[PDB]
């Protein structure tokens, strides 16, 4: 019965070493020269890593209150899903790569946040403080929607690259709240045809900013206070 | 006889039993399912 | 006598559903393909929505202290004006569209802020805290004016596209406080002719920033305190 | 003996009206069409305004403790110097305009800050809080100097337009702390020749930012506290 | 026995004057005209400055508890290393310049931070507050790494100039968190080929920002509190 | 007889009474005012 | 006789006394100093 | 005789003793080491 203390500093650091090594290897494999040559070696390394991570999660599961849930911790869920989807490449259909499975191997690095206590502690709050925002996100969404619909129905024939669709322009309105050449690439060339357009952008750039800014201040008096 | 899943298949000669809709590959040097 | 409790959670959610549906429909109608075909259907949907919103505001009016003002709430004023101007398309002159009536149908979405209690509560403060700024806005206006007049009278013959008029340059000075290529599109090409211009921009970009920044800090010690 | 109460709300508002009117007129005169025609009228208006401002400052001087200093208030100094330099166009040498006297007429608008009590009260603190910064300005100056000297001596032959001189590059380093295409116009084209330059910019953009940012925080714990 | 009080305000100001003079001279020597002519003079000035700084550090060493460490202060270490490396040009191998020794003469200016008490006092905290950040830096590093690997393996064949290598793209991801035309130079031209790329950038620009921003707030509730 | 406001007019044959300065339309399939 | 400062001079005929180094102008329609 | 380190060497005639692997220069107008 696995009821001995099998998870201590040494085991944790073995896990960390394995994670860092997988990170290094996934980094290396992004070089064509270094890849074509040792292809076989890289693949077999990946196989061993996958197994040594699966048995890792398996020990984590068993050794700790199996009949108990063990599924409360969102993290364990994260590790579980990663290992599942990565194994499925072995027992399922046709999931070689197709610019979507490799992203999984890479994402496998995030476990470096699960292991390090401080990182997990930090990410916990950095997430929990999202629902605090809540409303402001809805307000920004409503504003984005209004301005996107209007920009579409107005400039859809003057600038088909920025305001061509309901979404093609939902992207322009995002590039314009970060203030990337919204006056030299987005507006300046439109303002040349529809001369009353200077309202649309100016108005946006004000309200948008005014909203964003306040969001900022908000999350301060929610944190700096306590 | 046709082997099932997780069986060292051959790139040239496919032994993947077609009854269970299988297709041998070379990527993992063994037989897996097909969809 | 309409003195029964006719406005409860169910009715409010009916209203919300109608608003979201009008939002969805106004979004869809911004696609030419999807529009040409079902034109009649869209128009009749809009008609029904307009009526079902007018009777909505009418019930809101009557059922609640008619002889009483009912006009205190700025919101009710907003809904009132929207429905009025939208109906006027039916009983007035020539107000088909002309790139100005459709903006009204779209703006009709903002009522989603009136319904949701939290959103109204938020927007209330987000507005009330404008007069708090007050002065700083006047200071920025004075600075904008001074710098616009000077830039005009100086560069009006070197860069007629940015500093051509008192307002054509009031726009440049706005693009330059957001820092959009004010050194690569606005100044760099002027600084090539009038070599002492590097003052004008630099000075602006400092003071402007210095002002804006402080405004920021201001609205913090007005909020984070209490 | 001018010892009666001659300065009250009415007189102050006369002054304010005159200031706003001079502002409007200086704005208008920046239109060539509107200027060529009524040249004489504009000039004579300016003359009358100048006199009515000189006698204004003169009354301010006399009516209030003449033998006393009266020169403590920096503001009175500002008004004094403006009126002096503007009159000198009448009793001195050759100071017609030459793109430098008109700036004076324009700057004459700032008195709108002297009159309005709130504006003066605000500008007072907005200035007094400069010496609070103090050091950080010296640090930024030292950093600017170091980085400008190094950039000069390094890239003076690769990019003679941005790093040509000790000052020609003191301008580039200013455009790069505001983050204007410092990666697409300043660096990207240099990094193509001297491949180890990515240090110089990156390093700057970090330290610079890190410094600026902290300055920000500083002026908060100097204000939001008290 | 050097046990008299030999370091007082006058000596400190001599040191400061020498530092400022070396700064001025290193600045001047960055002009080709002014250099070719007086080459000999500049070189000999530099020699004298070097000696007068070496004997400066030597007096600092001896006159103060020689047998004692004297090496606690990181600053003294800084001065020591600078003078050492600068002398080595005289007693070592081949270290003329090669775009690396002159940077040392320039860096010699930082001692202006060691002398001025306020500057040292400030830099002390401005450094000590780095370990406070700690984690957040690791988080940003992990995020940078993930996004760089993914961007490489995805766009390495569509945009070989921005995402060509593991590091060539570690630079793009840095230019994109500062928001330099990440939508007009980096993405807009990629989004034209791989149409689902709008995720990659958008996602980054959100998370990145969301992280950075919070870092900001962090260092506030670590300072503005106390 | 000429109908007043809010009256199902005809695109071809305009029945909008001109005494009250009216102009039948097709957008709303009825008669409205004119300015 | 030559008038001094602040004297309505003439654009064509300059009456600005040259003893005090003066030069009549038209901008202010009077005589001012010269440097 | 060949002088050691810190010795006013000559640009034309190198007196830098080669036994200690030295190379006279002109930059500092004296003899220094070589690597
Ligand atoms: C509390 C209240 C909250 C208020 C929120 C208000 C939100 C209200 C929600 C409004 C919903 C908007 C309705 C969109 C209608 C799309 C249908 C369509 O025609 O698609 C077209 C294709 O194009 C597409 O592929 C559609 C892509 C999805 C649209 C994404 C925008 C989401 C707006 C959300 C913005 C979020 C904020 C933005 C920042 C995050 C199909 O038409 P077609 O091209 O002619 O081809 C023939 C049709 N066919 C393709 C089927 C064969
Ligand atoms: C309380 C909650 C907070 C709300 C905040 C949420 C957002 C707030 C509001 C957001 C919406 C802002 C809309 C931006 C205006 C764009 C105008 C434009 O440029 O298009 C046209 C302007 O056409 C004109 O002729 C000028 C008329 C100005 C239109 C003003 C719209 C009404 C705004 C009232 C809004 C009420 C505000 C109530 C909000 C409270 C320009 O193109 P064109 O006309 O075709 O010109 C000729 C073209 N041609 C050459 C081909 C012929
Ligand atoms: C407490 C004190 C507060 C201090 C505030 C200081 C403010 C002091 C206020 C100063 C008022 C400025 C006077 C402007 C004179 C314009 C008249 C004119 O000639 O127009 C021209 C046209 O061009 C136009 O259409 C005019 C457009 C309005 C100007 C907008 C600038 C507002 C400045 C506010 C900046 C706000 C800040 C900016 C950021 C928000 C007409 O001339 P024309 O072209 O030759 O054609 C012939 C004439 N015709 C057309 C009639 C036939
Ligand atoms: C207390 C309340 C706070 C005030 C803050 C509000 C804002 C503060 C101030 C705002 C105004 C700032 C003005 C910017 C200067 C622009 C100069 C320029 O570039 O134009 C010309 C400079 O001409 C020169 O020869 C250089 C002389 C410098 C002019 C300095 C103006 C006086 C500033 C004193 C201000 C007093 C400050 C008092 C403020 C307190 C360049 O063009 P050009 O001359 O034609 O050159 C030759 C061209 N050519 C080749 C065709 C021949
Ligand atoms: C507590 C301690 C504080 C530490 C601060 C450290 C500061 C230490 C201060 C260092 C002083 C720097 C010395 C500069 C030498 C210039 C002399 C020169 O050669 O000029 C040349 C012309 O070019 C010019 O016109 C000169 C312009 C002034 C230089 C402005 C840089 C100021 C650096 C400050 C940066 C401030 C920060 C930046 C952001 C604000 C002349 O040479 P020439 O072209 O070959 O022509 C022949 C000569 N002739 C023209 C005479 C005929
Ligand atoms: C405590 C107070 C806080 C201080 C903060 C103040 C600022 C802090 C520091 C500020 C100064 C930062 C300097 C930036 C470096 C630029 C390097 C570069 O790109 O030029 C060259 C780098 O040449 C190389 O070969 C790479 C060597 C790196 C040089 C590192 C300098 C030493 C930094 C130690 C500094 C000590 C830090 C101590 C500071 C504490 C590139 O060009 P090139 O060489 O010609 O390349 C070949 C060109 N070719 C193709 C024509 C052949
Ligand atoms: C707590 C946990 C922390 C988590 C952190 C996760 C970090 C995990 C660490 C992962 C390490 C990454 C491994 C990189 C492999 C490089 C080897 C290589 O092939 O180089 C190639 C050359 O190219 C070079 O010169 C290499 C340059 C160094 C790479 C810099 C990226 C550092 C990533 C850090 C990003 C830091 C964040 C970014 C923002 C600061 C050589 O191959 P070749 O070109 O084909 O030529 C033949 C080989 N030859 C040259 C030898 C002959
Ligand atoms: C808890 C700690 C916080 C984590 C935060 C750290 C970062 C968070 C995450 C960071 C990673 C974010 C990845 C960005 C996605 C890029 C997708 C892309 O554009 O490439 C391709 C998308 O291919 C598609 O077909 C669309 C599918 C979307 C891919 C989604 C990846 C899974 C994300 C789940 C991540 C799980 C999140 C879990 C994180 C918690 C586009 O190119 P292509 O496919 O080749 O298209 C055809 C090209 N062709 C024309 C040549 C044919
Ligand atoms: C939303 C709030 C607005 C504020 C209004 C303020 C005053 C309003 C000022 C002018 C109002 C009306 C201008 C008259 C012209 C109108 C029609 C027109 O022709 O436009 C003309 C100019 O118009 C502009 O350039 C707009 C000026 C931008 C002001 C931005 C100030 C930002 C405030 C800072 C906020 C921070 C401080 C806080 C203060 C909030 C352009 O058209 P055109 O000249 O005929 O050219 C022919 C066509 N062509 C272009 C193809 C060649
Ligand atoms: C407003 C405050 C200013 C500060 C001054 C500081 C020192 C003042 C420095 C120099 C002062 C005078 C420079 C000498 C040259 C003057 C005339 C001239 O010819 O200019 C020349 C260069 O001039 C420049 O490039 C300006 C340098 C910009 C300094 C910006 C520092 C920002 C401080 C950071 C603030 C943050 C930290 C906080 C500190 C505040 C350009 O003309 P040219 O070379 O003859 O070229 C021929 C014509 N051509 C261009 C078409 C080819
Ligand atoms: C100052 C701190 C640095 C950090 C280092 C981190 C890891 C250091 C990474 C790499 C270190 C060394 C890279 C190996 C290459 C070196 C020489 C070289 O050739 O460069 C090559 C690439 O080099 C780059 O592109 C630089 C990568 C920029 C990293 C910026 C990360 C910002 C951290 C985020 C900070 C926020 C989070 C907080 C973390 C602080 C370019 O030259 P080339 O490929 O040979 O091309 C041939 C010439 N050609 C270009 C003309 C074609
Ligand atoms: C990560 C969160 C995302 C949010 C999603 C929100 C709704 C999601 C919306 C749409 C979802 C799916 C869009 C349908 C199209 C998908 C495939 C496609 O073809 O794309 C198309 C459009 O696609 C876009 O342009 C993306 C729209 C960017 C939305 C950015 C909103 C930022 C939120 C603000 C955050 C601040 C507030 C806080 C809220 C967070 C482009 O491809 P194409 O049209 O076929 O063109 C043919 C190829 N060609 C391009 C070469 C010609």
CSV table of C-alpha atoms in Angstrom, one decimal, chain A residues 1 6 8 18 22 26 34 61 65 71 74 103 113 140 145-146 155 177 182 186 192 212 220:
chain,number,residue,atom,x,y,z
A,1,UNK,CA,0.0,0.0,0.0
A,6,UNK,CA,7.5,9.2,-1.4
A,8,UNK,CA,10.0,15.0,-0.9
A,18,UNK,CA,13.0,16.7,-16.2
A,22,UNK,CA,12.1,18.8,-21.9
A,26,UNK,CA,11.9,21.3,-27.4
A,34,UNK,CA,20.1,20.1,-35.6
A,61,UNK,CA,-2.6,10.0,-8.4
A,65,UNK,CA,-6.0,9.5,-1.5
A,71,UNK,CA,-9.4,16.5,-8.8
A,74,UNK,CA,-7.1,22.7,-11.1
A,103,UNK,CA,2.0,23.2,-29.5
A,113,UNK,CA,4.6,26.9,-12.8
A,140,UNK,CA,-15.2,47.3,-23.1
A,145,UNK,CA,-19.1,46.0,-30.4
A,146,UNK,CA,-20.8,49.3,-31.0
A,155,UNK,CA,-16.1,52.6,-43.9
A,177,UNK,CA,-6.6,50.9,-28.6
A,182,UNK,CA,-4.0,54.5,-35.7
A,186,UNK,CA,-5.6,53.5,-40.0
A,192,UNK,CA,-8.7,61.7,-46.7
A,212,UNK,CA,-8.9,51.3,-20.0
A,220,UNK,CA,-5.2,49.4,-7.7
